[PDB]
Design a protein around this ligand. Structure first.
Ligand SMILES: *[C@@H]1O[C@H](CO[C@@H]2O[C@@H](C)[C@@H](O)[C@@H](O)[C@@H]2O)[C@@H](O[C@@H]2O[C@H](CO)[C@@H](O[C@@H]3O[C@H](CO[C@H]4O[C@H](CO)[C@@H](O)[C@H](O)[C@@H]4O)[C@@H](O)[C@H](O[C@H]4O[C@H](CO)[C@@H](O)[C@H](O)[C@@H]4O)[C@@H]3O)[C@H](O)[C@H]2NC(C)=O)[C@H](O)[C@H]1NC(C)=O
Ligand SMILES: *[C@@H]1O[C@H](CO)[C@@H](O[C@@H]2O[C@H](CO)[C@@H](O[C@@H]3O[C@H](CO)[C@@H](O)[C@H](O)[C@@H]3O)[C@H](O)[C@H]2NC(C)=O)[C@H](O)[C@H]1NC(C)=O
Ligand SMILES: *[C@@H]1O[C@H](CO[C@@H]2O[C@@H](C)[C@@H](O)[C@@H](O)[C@@H]2O)[C@@H](O)[C@H](O)[C@H]1NC(C)=O
Ligand SMILES: *[C@@H]1O[C@H](CO[C@@H]2O[C@@H](C)[C@@H](O)[C@@H](O)[C@@H]2O)[C@@H](O)[C@H](O)[C@H]1NC(C)=O
Ligand SMILES: *[C@@H]1O[C@H](CO)[C@@H](O)[C@H](O)[C@H]1NC(C)=O
Ligand SMILES: *[C@H]1O[C@H](CO)[C@@H](O)[C@H](O)[C@@H]1O
Ligand SMILES: *[C@H]1O[C@H](CO)[C@@H](O)[C@H](O)[C@@H]1O
Ligand SMILES: *[C@H]1O[C@H](CO)[C@@H](O)[C@H](O)[C@@H]1O
Ligand SMILES: *[C@H]1O[C@H](CO)[C@@H](O)[C@H](O)[C@@H]1O
Ligand SMILES: *[C@H]1O[C@H](CO)[C@@H](O)[C@H](O)[C@@H]1O
Ligand SMILES: *[C@H]1O[C@H](CO)[C@@H](O)[C@H](O)[C@@H]1O
Ligand SMILES: [Ca+2]
Ligand SMILES: [Ca+2]
Ligand SMILES: [Ca+2]
Ligand SMILES: [Ca+2]
Ligand SMILES: [Ca+2]
Ligand SMILES: [Ca+2]
Ligand SMILES: [Ca+2]
Ligand SMILES: [Ca+2]
Ligand SMILES: [Ca+2]
Ligand SMILES: [Ca+2]
Ligand SMILES: [Ca+2]
Ligand SMILES: [Ca+2]
Ligand SMILES: [Ca+2]
Ligand SMILES: [Ca+2]
Ligand SMILES: [Ca+2]
Ligand SMILES: [Ca+2]
Ligand SMILES: [Ca+2]
Ligand SMILES: [Ca+2]
Ligand SMILES: [Ca+2]
Ligand SMILES: [Ca+2]
Ligand SMILES: [Ca+2]
Ligand SMILES: [Ca+2]
Ligand SMILES: [Ca+2]
Ligand SMILES: [Ca+2]
Lengths: 522, 521
């Protein structure tokens, strides 16, 4: 019937069309007959002036306000004239102009993506809104050139996705900034921009690592209660709770190790809580584990080997063996007497021992094997001059400070018959009473020795002599046990000299005789 | 010194050496003189028989009991003889035989390793212990042939640091839940003894699998007038993890509109979408809803899926119509084909129930016709008459199609205006009267009557007189009449005249009736 095309948002009084002459009616007819024009929507967008008989724009025309995002827009206007009654229906189609730019819901939007997020994972992103319809509507999206991310759009309606091309890391890149540009295909060309500032969330993917797998620490033997050994330090590359670690022992530690050593969980300092002995254990090997606070927590392992240094804290324990009581006087030099065994609990320089004895002593000490010493006899010996020795043996434990261990040994010398029984002085003379009764003691001879026991035993005897052959009698009788001389005859008148022999009882028996004389002629 | 070599743990009374003749001593001296042999440690390991003067093993010799894990083992025996006193020291070195196998601290050891463990990561393992000393001590480790793991041992020395298991290829819980391996430690001695430890390592589930739907987008159709709490669709998320990491919670995305949240709600556990508000097609044609689902794991991964729901236009609105251009007068002379009033029909609904069908009374000369779109004009056809038909009340019925169909009726009152097209008619022509003989002046004689079919001024009867030949003769104008009433007055003691009845309308129409009076007295 009739179609008019009018551009959106036109100048006031914009020429639409000569509707008057188009319907075969003159202005002259238009003036008297009642001219009515009615339309839907606003109905005041267009109006006709009768003076020149034309149709024109009165107010601003917003197509998107009336028809929204619909493909076709047309305004139905009816024209009524009276006397006579006549009605004509005319439709005016509104043309869309690119006056509406691509508008994003927000200029700035921040997204949060985990670090451990794998590739091919897409993230939903809201598109820009546009009230325009057709070619002058947004169709082209352009993402900033980035290494990690790429853009993806469904060909149809559906939120566009952001795909992770390269893996992300918090430590390398804490924050990532991108810009998304949406451009519509219209004249003039309009701009849409949204800047995305995405922050990388820390994921516990860094295990705690020590400086080296093994550490070596020297430790004294007699360290007091609560002595520091070493503090271990672990490095972690995460943030906050994932970045700090607690130190602890491994579950495979020995009971003794746990008994002697302890570690503070927070500090990671190793302190001694038990008496450690070098003789008990020379060194300790301790496995250590450190764990962070993150839920997927990773452990860090390192083993400390501590060595205990031997301090001279034990005196050289020695034992006297093979106790030999007798030592003969005639013993030639080079004869062993007793045995000595010296041992030391300590080890090393303060483990070796040097033994010695009294210098003012004929005996000398010499060792044959290891720390076993044998007491050998040197120089000559005499029982009578010196009876017994009480030798004190000193054992020196080297190192600083040096220790001492002494032993008292009692050794006695055995008597050997090498002396002879000697009377006081030769010779002896006595004078007996004239009328001498029988069985009367006249004199008691005496002898003394230097030896002991049977070697010092004096046995008195008499000699026979020629005068005995002269036949007076068996004369005097002597007592071997006492040395008393007994007479059994009255003296008569008609020089007596006889030898009294005192002897020993030892196996090499030795004796001497003294001359005793009696003179009687009364 | 003097050296004799004896293997550890020998048979009872094993020949060691002829110590008697070796020390320059005859049997003759050996028998009576006390011949003593004494040693530290046990001191009962060796003893000499005097009958033949020889040295032999008396008790079991355990080298590991005496020297432990030391390189060199030697027994110091001292020989004491009396009369005269003489002492001879002899050392007997014990040779080690491989009688102690490589022993691990435990036959079975279980390790717990995370799935997310990166490559080149090593795990500490304790080595095997051995009481043997020398060549017959363990130095060689052999790990079971495994794809994922490889063995690592420090070369400087053994028992300096625990040997490690290094991850060559990454492991996964879903593919391999458990891994069993065997570690064999072999010492270099003859014969060779082996020590073994069986490792049962378990793979720990790590939340590294994101929840995934069947497809990114789903399409569901939904009616318009759905009641409060109507189910739309149930969504399904698939997860490949274990336990708390394997089950997911359903929720809306944070980017949803407030209206969307107002019209739709979702159960977190089930993942079912239900409507809790009245949705209207005129309000919104379709809804696009983003959905997010998150698992219970500490490193929780999200899953996104968008539901597109379409609203169907249901006939719940009657076609709103308005009567326009109200025209009260309608002339009788109006030619057929001529429009009367205007009707404007609009419908809120769209589609099959958007189209409207109008109609009018079938028993009526009027017809309804549309020229453009859904704009209708009521046009008059055929002739009409005021007197025959006084007024019309046109009822327009509008039917809204679809199931069920809607109805909208309209009553329009139109009246036709009277037009003078009829003529005043007397009862019957003609009329004749006889006047009194002795007639007085100014006397009423008769009252004429006339009637019309029209209305108002057109039905107004006005009585008048004609001149006539008798009147022209100038005798008189005869009777004088009142136009309003039609009364005839006589003023005098064969008369034929015409009484003309006329209208009062602008197009005046009239008719004449013959009136006669007879008086000759
Ligand atoms: C060698 O030193 C050992 C500790 O080292 C010292 O102490 C620390 C604190 C530092 O100052 C350091 O520099 C020192 O050198 C020492 O071990 C100690 O032994 C005593 C008893 O023998 C313990 O006393 C008990 O303590 C517990 C507390 O337990 C703690 O254990 C660990 C420590 O890290 C952690 O889990 C906590 O921090 C705990 O605090 C008490 O609970 C307990 O009392 C209970 O029993 C009594 C009696 O029934 C009740 O009345 C109470 O209510 C309690 O129920 C004891 O008092 C002492 O804790 C322990 N020290 C450490 C650090 O564990 C060792 O004895 C020293 N060697 C020798 C030979 O003495
Ligand atoms: C283990 O040793 C390290 C270093 O000796 C200790 O690290 C301490 O804290 C920070 C850790 O990052 C060290 O570096 C610092 O980093 C900040 C970051 O901004 C920087 O501003 C500093 O200038 C410094 O470079 C820092 O050197 C060190 N500080 C102290 C007082 O120790 C760590 O504490 C040790 N482990 C334990 C358990 O103490
Ligand atoms: C989801 O649907 C299940 C049935 O199909 C299953 O899920 C899909 C994704 C595939 O993994 C297929 O192999 C499965 O058999 C139901 O068993 C399950 O109950 C549904 N989910 C819920 C929460 O009910
Ligand atoms: C619809 O009902 C709403 C209340 O819903 C409540 O929660 C849902 C999940 C159902 O279980 C229901 O039984 C509960 O009472 C009202 O808040 C809302 O106003 C209602 N809308 C209407 C009546 O248009
Ligand atoms: C008595 O002693 C002297 C002293 O030399 C000795 O000559 C003499 O032989 C001894 N007498 C006897 C009987 O041996
Ligand atoms: C919007 O589009 C224009 C060109 O159409 C650019 O100049 C602008 O920077 C943005 O990309
Ligand atoms: C879109 O993006 C550009 C680049 O960031 C801005 O300059 C503009 O103002 C809008 O935010
Ligand atoms: C060293 O000290 C000890 C202490 O008993 C003595 O017995 C020994 O004789 C030496 O004087
Ligand atoms: C001579 O001397 C001895 C002592 O040596 C006395 O015992 C003896 O009786 C006599 O007088
Ligand atoms: C270890 O290997 C040795 C041979 O080298 C076997 O004899 C032993 O039984 C174990 O399998
Ligand atoms: C040590 O390893 C062997 C295989 O060499 C097993 O048979 C034994 O049970 C132990 O686990
Ligand atoms: Ca616009
Ligand atoms: Ca526009
Ligand atoms: Ca646009
Ligand atoms: Ca990292
Ligand atoms: Ca960490
Ligand atoms: Ca990290
Ligand atoms: Ca000590
Ligand atoms: Ca010591
Ligand atoms: Ca010492
Ligand atoms: Ca002497
Ligand atoms: Ca003597
Ligand atoms: Ca002597
Ligand atoms: Ca053995
Ligand atoms: Ca052995
Ligand atoms: Ca071995
Ligand atoms: Ca996995
Ligand atoms: Ca997993
Ligand atoms: Ca999961
Ligand atoms: Ca509705
Ligand atoms: Ca509807
Ligand atoms: Ca409808
Ligand atoms: Ca008529
Ligand atoms: Ca009429
Ligand atoms: Ca009339």
């Amino acid at each position: 019937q009739l179609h008019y095309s009018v551009p959106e948002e036109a100048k006031h009084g914009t020429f639409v069309g000569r509707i008057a002459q188009d319907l075969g009616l003159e202005l002259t007819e238009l003036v008297p007959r009642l001219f009515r024009v009615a339309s839907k929507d606003r109905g005041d967008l267009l109006e006709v002036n009768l003076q020149n008989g034309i149709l024109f724009v009165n107010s601003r025309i917003d197509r998107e306000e009336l028809c929204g995002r619909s493909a076709e827009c047309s305004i139905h206007l009816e024209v009524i004239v009276d006397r006579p009654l006549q009605v004509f229906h005319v439709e005016v189609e509104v043309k869309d102009i690119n006056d509406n730019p691509p508008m994003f819901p927000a200029t700035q939007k921040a997204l949060f993506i985990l670090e451990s997020r794998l590739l091919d994972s897409r993230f939903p992103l809201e598109g820009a809104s546009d009230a325009d319809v057709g070619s002058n509507a947004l169709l082209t999206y352009r993402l900033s050139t980035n290494e990690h991310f790429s853009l993806d759009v469904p060909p149809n309606v559906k939120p566009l996705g952001l795909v992770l091309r390269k893996p992300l890391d918090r430590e390398e890149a804490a924050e990532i900034r991108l810009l998304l540009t949406a451009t519509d295909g219209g004249k003039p060309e309009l701009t849409g921009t949204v800047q995305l500032l995405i922050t990388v969330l820390d994921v516990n993917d860094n295990a705690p690592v020590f400086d080296r797998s093994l550490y070596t620490v020297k430790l004294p033997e007699n360290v007091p209660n609560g002595t520091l050994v070493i503090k271990v330090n672990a490095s972690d590359l995460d943030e906050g709770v994932n970045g700090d670690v607690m130190y602890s022992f491994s579950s495979d530690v020995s009971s003794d190790i746990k008994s002697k050593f302890h570690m503070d969980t927070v500090s990671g300092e190793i302190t001694v809580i038990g008496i450690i002995d070098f003789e008990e254990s020379k060194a300790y090997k301790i496995p250590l584990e450190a764990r962070d606070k993150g839920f997927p927590q990773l452990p860090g392992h390192c083993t400390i080997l501590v060595e205990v240094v031997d301090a001279n804290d034990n005196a050289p324990q020695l034992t006297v063996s093979s106790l030999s009581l007798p030592v003969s006087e005639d013993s030639q030099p080079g004869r062993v007497v007793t045995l000595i065994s010296v041992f030391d609990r300590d080890s090393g320089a303060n483990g070796q021992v040097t033994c010695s004895l009294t210098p003012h002593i004929p005996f000398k000490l010499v060792s044959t094997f290891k720390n076993y010493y044998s007491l050998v006899l040197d120089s000559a010996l005499d029982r009578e001059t010196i009876a017994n020795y009480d030798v004190i043996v000193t054992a020196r434990d080297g190192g600083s400070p040096s220790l001492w261990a002494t032993a008292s040994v009692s050794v006695e010398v055995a008597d050997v018959n090498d002396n002879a029984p000697l009377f006081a002085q030769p010779e002896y003379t006595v004078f007996v009473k004239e009328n001498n009764p029988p069985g009367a003691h006249i004199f008691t001879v005496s002898a003394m020795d230097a030896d002991a026991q049977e070697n010092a035993l004096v046995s008195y005897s008499l000699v026979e002599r020629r005068v005995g052959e002269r036949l007076l009698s068996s004369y005097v009788s002597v007592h071997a046990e006492s040395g008393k001389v007994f007479a059994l005859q009255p003296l008569d008148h008609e020089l007596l000299q006889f030898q009294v022999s005192a002897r020993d009882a030892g196996v090499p028996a030795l004796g001497s005789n003294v001359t005793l004389q009696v003179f009687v002629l009364d």
